[PDB]
Amino acid sequence: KVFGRCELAAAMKRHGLDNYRGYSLGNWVCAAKFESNFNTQATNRNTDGSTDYGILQINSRWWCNDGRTPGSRNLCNIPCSALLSSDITASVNCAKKIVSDGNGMNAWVAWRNRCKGTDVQAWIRGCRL
Numbered sequence: 001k002v003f004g005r006c007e008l009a010a011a012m013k014r015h016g017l018d019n020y021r022g023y024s025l026g027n028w029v030c031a032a033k034f035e036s037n038f039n040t041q042a043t044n045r046n047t048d049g050s051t052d053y054g055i056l057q058i059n060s061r062w063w064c065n066d067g068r069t070p071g072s073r074n075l076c077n078i079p080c081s082a083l084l085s086s087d088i089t090a091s092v093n094c095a096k097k098i099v100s101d102g103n104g105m106n107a108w109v110a111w112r113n114r115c116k117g118t119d120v121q122a123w124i125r126g127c128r129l
Protein backbone atom coordinates (compact mmCIF):
# COMPACT_ATOMS: atom_id res chain seq x y z
CA LYS A 1 0.00 0.00 0.00
CA VAL A 2 1.25 3.46 -0.86
CA PHE A 3 -0.18 5.77 1.79
CA GLY A 4 -1.17 9.34 1.15
CA ARG A 5 0.76 11.83 3.29
CA CYS A 6 -2.15 12.85 5.53
CA GLU A 7 -3.45 9.27 5.49
CA LEU A 8 -0.15 8.06 6.93
CA ALA A 9 -0.07 10.95 9.43
CA ALA A 10 -3.53 9.93 10.70
CA ALA A 11 -2.53 6.28 11.02
CA MET A 12 0.71 7.12 12.84
CA LYS A 13 -1.20 9.44 15.19
CA ARG A 14 -3.84 6.82 15.92
CA HIS A 15 -1.04 4.34 16.73
CA GLY A 16 0.52 6.73 19.23
CA LEU A 17 3.63 7.92 17.38
CA ASP A 18 2.89 11.67 17.69
CA ASN A 19 5.43 12.92 20.27
CA TYR A 20 6.57 9.36 21.02
CA ARG A 21 9.97 9.67 22.77
CA GLY A 22 9.55 13.40 22.08
CA TYR A 23 9.38 13.09 18.29
CA SER A 24 6.52 15.10 16.83
CA LEU A 25 4.36 13.53 14.12
CA GLY A 26 6.08 15.41 11.28
CA ASN A 27 9.37 13.68 12.15
CA TRP A 28 7.76 10.28 11.59
CA VAL A 29 6.04 11.31 8.37
CA CYS A 30 9.30 12.82 7.07
CA ALA A 31 11.22 9.66 7.97
CA ALA A 32 8.68 7.46 6.17
CA LYS A 33 8.73 9.69 3.10
CA PHE A 34 12.46 9.36 2.61
CA GLU A 35 12.77 5.76 3.83
CA SER A 36 9.96 4.27 1.74
CA ASN A 37 8.02 6.95 -0.16
CA PHE A 38 5.10 5.92 2.10
CA ASN A 39 5.11 2.46 0.48
CA THR A 40 4.52 -0.37 2.95
CA GLN A 41 5.96 -2.89 0.46
CA ALA A 42 9.41 -1.24 0.18
CA THR A 43 12.42 -3.53 0.69
CA ASN A 44 16.13 -2.75 0.33
CA ARG A 45 19.17 -4.98 0.77
CA ASN A 46 22.01 -3.63 2.93
CA THR A 47 25.70 -4.26 2.22
CA ASP A 48 25.99 -6.54 5.27
CA GLY A 49 23.41 -9.05 3.97
CA SER A 50 20.52 -7.71 6.01
CA THR A 51 17.44 -6.14 4.42
CA ASP A 52 15.24 -3.19 5.42
CA TYR A 53 11.47 -3.60 5.34
CA GLY A 54 8.37 -1.46 5.19
CA ILE A 55 7.39 2.17 5.61
CA LEU A 56 10.17 2.77 8.13
CA GLN A 57 12.76 0.44 6.58
CA ILE A 58 13.31 -1.71 9.64
CA ASN A 59 16.38 -3.93 9.51
CA SER A 60 16.58 -7.71 9.63
CA ARG A 61 19.87 -7.94 11.60
CA TRP A 62 18.42 -6.72 14.93
CA TRP A 63 14.71 -6.23 14.57
CA CYS A 64 12.77 -8.71 12.47
CA ASN A 65 13.33 -12.24 11.13
CA ASP A 66 13.70 -12.70 7.35
CA GLY A 67 15.27 -16.17 7.42
CA ARG A 68 18.45 -15.12 5.60
CA THR A 69 20.29 -12.58 7.76
CA PRO A 70 23.49 -13.44 9.59
CA GLY A 71 23.50 -12.53 13.29
CA SER A 72 19.76 -11.93 13.46
CA ARG A 73 18.25 -11.14 16.88
CA ASN A 74 14.61 -10.50 15.96
CA LEU A 75 14.11 -8.04 18.82
CA CYS A 76 10.62 -7.11 17.60
CA ASN A 77 9.72 -10.81 17.50
CA ILE A 78 8.09 -10.64 14.06
CA PRO A 79 8.68 -11.93 10.56
CA CYS A 80 10.01 -9.09 8.42
CA SER A 81 7.13 -9.71 6.00
CA ALA A 82 4.72 -8.43 8.69
CA LEU A 83 6.35 -5.04 8.17
CA LEU A 84 5.05 -4.97 4.58
CA SER A 85 1.35 -5.14 5.45
CA SER A 86 -1.13 -2.40 4.54
CA ASP A 87 -1.80 -2.34 8.32
CA ILE A 88 1.10 -0.39 9.88
CA THR A 89 0.60 -1.78 13.41
CA ALA A 90 3.64 -4.06 13.35
CA SER A 91 5.90 -1.37 11.87
CA VAL A 92 4.76 1.13 14.50
CA ASN A 93 5.28 -1.29 17.39
CA CYS A 94 8.74 -2.18 16.22
CA ALA A 95 9.64 1.48 15.49
CA LYS A 96 8.69 2.30 19.09
CA LYS A 97 11.29 -0.24 20.27
CA ILE A 98 13.92 1.09 17.85
CA VAL A 99 13.45 4.75 18.83
CA SER A 100 13.74 3.72 22.50
CA ASP A 101 17.11 1.99 21.92
CA GLY A 102 19.20 5.02 22.98
CA ASN A 103 19.89 7.03 19.80
CA GLY A 104 16.33 8.24 19.27
CA MET A 105 15.46 8.79 15.61
CA ASN A 106 19.15 8.86 14.63
CA ALA A 107 18.56 5.13 14.07
CA TRP A 108 17.00 6.19 10.73
CA VAL A 109 19.74 7.43 8.45
CA ALA A 110 17.27 9.25 6.17
CA TRP A 111 15.78 11.00 9.18
CA ARG A 112 19.16 12.25 10.36
CA ASN A 113 20.19 13.34 6.85
CA ARG A 114 16.94 14.75 5.50
CA CYS A 115 14.57 15.51 8.37
CA LYS A 116 16.58 16.35 11.50
CA GLY A 117 16.94 20.13 11.87
CA THR A 118 14.34 20.90 9.19
CA ASP A 119 10.81 22.28 9.48
CA VAL A 120 9.28 18.84 9.91
CA GLN A 121 5.86 20.27 10.76
CA ALA A 122 5.57 20.94 7.00
CA TRP A 123 4.95 17.20 6.57
CA ILE A 124 1.61 17.39 8.37
CA ARG A 125 0.54 20.78 6.98
CA GLY A 126 -3.01 20.75 5.62
CA CYS A 127 -3.96 17.48 7.35
CA ARG A 128 -7.10 17.04 9.53
CA LEU A 129 -5.69 15.24 12.53
Ligand SMILES: [Cl-]
Nearest residue numbers: 024025026121
Ligand atom coordinates in the same frame (compact mmCIF):
# COMPACT_ATOMS: atom_id res chain seq x y z
CL1 LIG B 1 5.46 18.04 13.55
Ligand SMILES: [Cl-]
Nearest residue numbers: 021103104105
Ligand atom coordinates in the same frame (compact mmCIF):
# COMPACT_ATOMS: atom_id res chain seq x y z
CL1 LIG C 1 15.95 11.57 21.71
